[PDB]
Scaffold this active site. Structure first.
Site, mmCIF file in Angstrom:
data_model
loop_
_atom_site.group_PDB
_atom_site.id
_atom_site.type_symbol
_atom_site.label_atom_id
_atom_site.label_comp_id
_atom_site.label_asym_id
_atom_site.label_seq_id
_atom_site.Cartn_x
_atom_site.Cartn_y
_atom_site.Cartn_z
ATOM 1 N N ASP A 34 -4.882 -2.669 -1.111
ATOM 2 C CA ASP A 34 -3.484 -2.351 -2.413
ATOM 3 C C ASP A 34 -2.610 -1.439 -2.161
ATOM 4 O OD1 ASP A 34 -2.072 -1.591 -4.568
ATOM 5 O OD2 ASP A 34 -4.033 0.254 -4.571
ATOM 6 N N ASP A 63 3.269 -5.499 -4.065
ATOM 7 C CA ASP A 63 1.426 -4.646 -4.386
ATOM 8 C C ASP A 63 0.478 -5.770 -4.273
ATOM 9 O OD1 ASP A 63 -0.182 -3.281 -5.655
ATOM 10 O OD2 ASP A 63 0.875 -2.949 -6.966
HETATM 11 C C1 3LN Z 1 -0.755 6.903 -7.361
HETATM 12 C C2 3LN Z 1 -0.200 6.183 -8.015
HETATM 13 C C3 3LN Z 1 0.612 5.315 -6.509
HETATM 14 C C4 3LN Z 1 0.867 5.587 -8.794
HETATM 15 C C5 3LN Z 1 -0.954 4.921 -8.020
HETATM 16 O O1 3LN Z 1 -2.538 4.593 -7.810
HETATM 17 C C6 3LN Z 1 -3.448 4.491 -7.925
HETATM 18 C C7 3LN Z 1 -4.495 4.768 -8.402
HETATM 19 C C8 3LN Z 1 -5.634 4.213 -8.582
HETATM 20 C C9 3LN Z 1 -5.891 2.335 -8.553
HETATM 21 C C10 3LN Z 1 -4.223 2.096 -8.072
HETATM 22 C C11 3LN Z 1 -3.526 2.980 -8.355
HETATM 23 C C12 3LN Z 1 -4.115 0.174 -8.230
HETATM 24 C C13 3LN Z 1 -3.055 0.495 -10.080
HETATM 25 O O2 3LN Z 1 -2.295 -0.428 -9.778
HETATM 26 C C14 3LN Z 1 -2.325 -0.374 -7.614
HETATM 27 N N1 3LN Z 1 -1.502 -1.383 -6.796
HETATM 28 N N2 3LN Z 1 -3.682 -0.167 -7.426
HETATM 29 C C15 3LN Z 1 -5.445 -0.013 -8.537
HETATM 30 C C16 3LN Z 1 -5.804 -1.548 -9.187
HETATM 31 C C17 3LN Z 1 -7.092 -1.927 -9.347
HETATM 32 C C18 3LN Z 1 -7.385 -3.842 -8.881
HETATM 33 C C19 3LN Z 1 -6.609 -4.053 -8.749
HETATM 34 N N3 3LN Z 1 -6.668 -5.607 -8.891
HETATM 35 C C20 3LN Z 1 -7.672 -5.893 -9.894
HETATM 36 N N4 3LN Z 1 -7.731 -4.993 -10.598
HETATM 37 C C21 3LN Z 1 -8.221 -4.119 -10.608
HETATM 38 C C22 3LN Z 1 -8.548 -1.453 -9.149
HETATM 39 C C23 3LN Z 1 -8.030 -0.405 -9.208
HETATM 40 C C24 3LN Z 1 -6.921 0.402 -9.287
HETATM 41 O O3 3LN Z 1 -6.791 2.338 -8.924
#
Ligand code: 3LN
Length: 364
Positions: free
Chosen positions: A34, A220
């Protein structure tokens, strides 16, 4: 870097994951990659969706930081206990580092039912780390403690099982054709970049370019869709509608709130121009409908409006080989050796172009 090729797996729309080990002896976990967050966080309890989880009781190198962390994001939340332990990436460089690890003890809408990953690797910068910027993200730890160069790159190959490559510490030239073109990282928090011009089938949307980056544009890997700010999405849809008016579709469809079904060329290519490395110089990346019409016969419109800014997610990244050159504060794009195309149209990275006032496209 041949051992890192093909080190990414996933299922359609549930992200891409890499094998990691944590603790001594090593406990194997599949971790979501991520570039839009900055924490290393792992399932630590027998949630029923998980194939496995971090068992801190089995690790002699585990150390408790005696501090909690709480992370709500737009589509869910996770909560956990901070610590450090030894971490390594089997199909990555041959090194072991001591990293921060959030042991996840409570979550909502975080883990996916049916998926084969158990944690998240936040590869973005300290500033958006939780609970604050003093929690050194994994990659920072990696670079600080080893001689792995300060960059990584991603070839997300898409399709149902998906695959790809995370080349840690370098670039593998077999994963791309043509030249890499680099856009500057405007600021080190997310991987923020600036879009200076947008074209649908060659037609400039002719919007103030400030709109394309209101309030930011980011790259992203943890977002499936190309996400466009409200005003720009509207304008973009209107032109995809006009360009593709051979057929008609419901308003729900464009909102990603119903599908459309059959049993390509009616749809335009989408082009984003990114700020270049030199004053008044841009380049453009071009994606096909193959990238933004997603297989759910049936298809989903993989472009959607946003309140957080432009997100260049999987829909964009699957067209290209993307180089996160942290050392030089820039991100590189090249046509991916693995991307899915017609024998007519093709994903492209082209430049240089002349674009004036590119600094005015950024939002303050
Ligand atoms: C604290 C902050 C910086 C605002 C963001 O923190 C975050 C904290 C947790 C978090 C995310 C961001 C996400 C949501 O978007 C991204 N890029 N990761 C995310 C995407 C997925 C996912 C990716 N692709 C397909 N399906 C699901 C799963 C879990 C997930 O959890």
């Amino acid at each position: 870097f041949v051992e890192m090729v093909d080190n990414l797996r996933g299922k359609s729309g549930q992200g891409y994951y890499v094998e990691m080990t944590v603790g001594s002896p090593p406990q194997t976990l599949n971790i979501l990659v991520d570039t839009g967050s900055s924490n290393f966080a792992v399932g630590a309890a027998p949630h029923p969706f998980l194939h496995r989880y971090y068992q801190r009781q089995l690790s002699s190198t585990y150390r408790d930081l005696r501090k909690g962390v709480y992370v709500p994001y737009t589509q869910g939340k996770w909560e956990g206990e901070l610590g450090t332990d030894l971490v390594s990436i089997p199909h990555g460089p041959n090194v072991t580092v001591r990293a921060n690890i959030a042991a996840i003890t409570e979550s909502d809408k975080f883990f996916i039912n049916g998926s084969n990953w158990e944690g998240i690797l936040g590869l973005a910068y300290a500033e958006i780390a939780r609970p604050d910027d003093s929690l050194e993200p994994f990659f920072d730890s990696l670079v600080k403690q080893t001689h792995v160069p300060n960059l990584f790159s991603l070839q997300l190959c898409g399709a149902a099982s998906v695959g790809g490559s995370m080349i840690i510490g370098g670039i593998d030239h077999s994963l791309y054709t043509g030249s890499l073109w680099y856009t500057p990282i405007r600021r080190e928090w997310y991987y923020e970049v600036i879009i200076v011009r947008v074209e649908i089938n060659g037609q400039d949307l002719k919007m103030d370019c400030k709109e394309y980056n209101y309030d930011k544009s980011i790259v992203d890997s943890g977002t499936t869709n190309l996400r466009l700010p409200k005003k720009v999405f509207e304008a973009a849809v209107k032109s995809i509608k006009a360009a593709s008016s051979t057929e008609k579709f419901p308003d729900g469809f464009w909102l990603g709130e119903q599908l459309v079904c059959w049993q390509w060329n009616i749809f335009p290519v989408i082009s984003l121009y990114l700020m270049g490395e030199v004053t008044n110089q841009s380049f453009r990346i071009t994606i096909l409908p193959q990238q933004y019409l997603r297989p759910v016969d049936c298809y989903k419109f993989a472009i959607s409006q946003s309140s957080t800014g432009t997100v260049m997610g999987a829909v964009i990244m699957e067209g290209f080989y993307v180089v996160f050159d942290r050392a030089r504060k820039r991100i590189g794009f090249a046509v991916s050796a693995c991307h899915v195309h017609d024998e007519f149209r093709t994903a492209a990275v082209e430049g240089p172009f002349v674009t004036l006032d590119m600094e005015d496209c950024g939002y303050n």
